[PDB]
Amino acid sequence: MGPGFDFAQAIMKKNTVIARTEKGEFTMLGVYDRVAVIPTHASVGEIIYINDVETRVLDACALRDLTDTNLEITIVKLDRNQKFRDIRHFLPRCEDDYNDAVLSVHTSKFPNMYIPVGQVTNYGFLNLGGTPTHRILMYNFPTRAGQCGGVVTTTGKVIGIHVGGNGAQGFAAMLLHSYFTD
Numbered sequence: 001m002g003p004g005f006d007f008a009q010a011i012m013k014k015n016t017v018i019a020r021t022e023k024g025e026f027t028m029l030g031v032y033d034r035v036a037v038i039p040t041h042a043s044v045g046e047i048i049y050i051n052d053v054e055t056r057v058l059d060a061c062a063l064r065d066l067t068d069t070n071l072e073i074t075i076v077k078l079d080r081n082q083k084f085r086d087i088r089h090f091l092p093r094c095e096d097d098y099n100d101a102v103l104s105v106h107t108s109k110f111p112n113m114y115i116p117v118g119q120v121t122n123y124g125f126l127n128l129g130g131t132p133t134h135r136i137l138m139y140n141f142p143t144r145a146g147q148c149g150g151v152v153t154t155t156g157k158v159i160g161i162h163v164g165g166n167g168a169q170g171f172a173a174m175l176l177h178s179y180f181t182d
């Protein structure tokens with residue numbers, strides 16, 4: 001509907017797949033080559049479904065900060081015959097607050113879904129489902145089950161993936177450029 005939605009759509013149309021684990025269907029962001037991200041609570045195993053195709057997982061790494069605290073991001077390398085567009089230059093280098101973000105979801109339950117969530121706070125610590133978690137972003141939108149993995153963007157930046165909510169607020173795990181150096 002406006003330039004935030006333009007950037008969000010450009011990301012969704014080229015850099016997402018539908019990932020299915022035993023824990024559900026998730027929006028999954030492809031970042032570069034065969035490397036994608038998904039919330040750690042998806043419990044990625046040795047095999048995952050990508051757009052309903054059985055796919056071997058070559059590597060899966062549940063990220064933690066240097067205090068050994070959960071970050072809720074799992075980096076997955078997929079045994080896929082095709083690379084993602086490289087979007088690493090749209091990842092922030094540092095923790096930050098943002099204005100006027102969009103949360104975008106694409107699953108069987110919620111196809112072509114876009115949500116203007118407004119201001120995004122560097123919230124920091126969250127007890128997420130009982131698990132101490134760091135580098136959490138917060139937005140004041142009543143997100144729901146089905147939105148996990150959803151991409152949080154501003155114009156020109158991919159800043160996080162949706163990992164939870166409390167009924168009134170939503171929470172995303174930060175994406176940082178430093179997670180995807182090779």
Ligand SMILES: Nc1nnc2ccccn12
Nearest residue numbers: 143144145164165166167
């Ligand atoms: N997954 C998720 N995102 N937002 C919420 C809110 C309530 C319950 C679950 N949620």
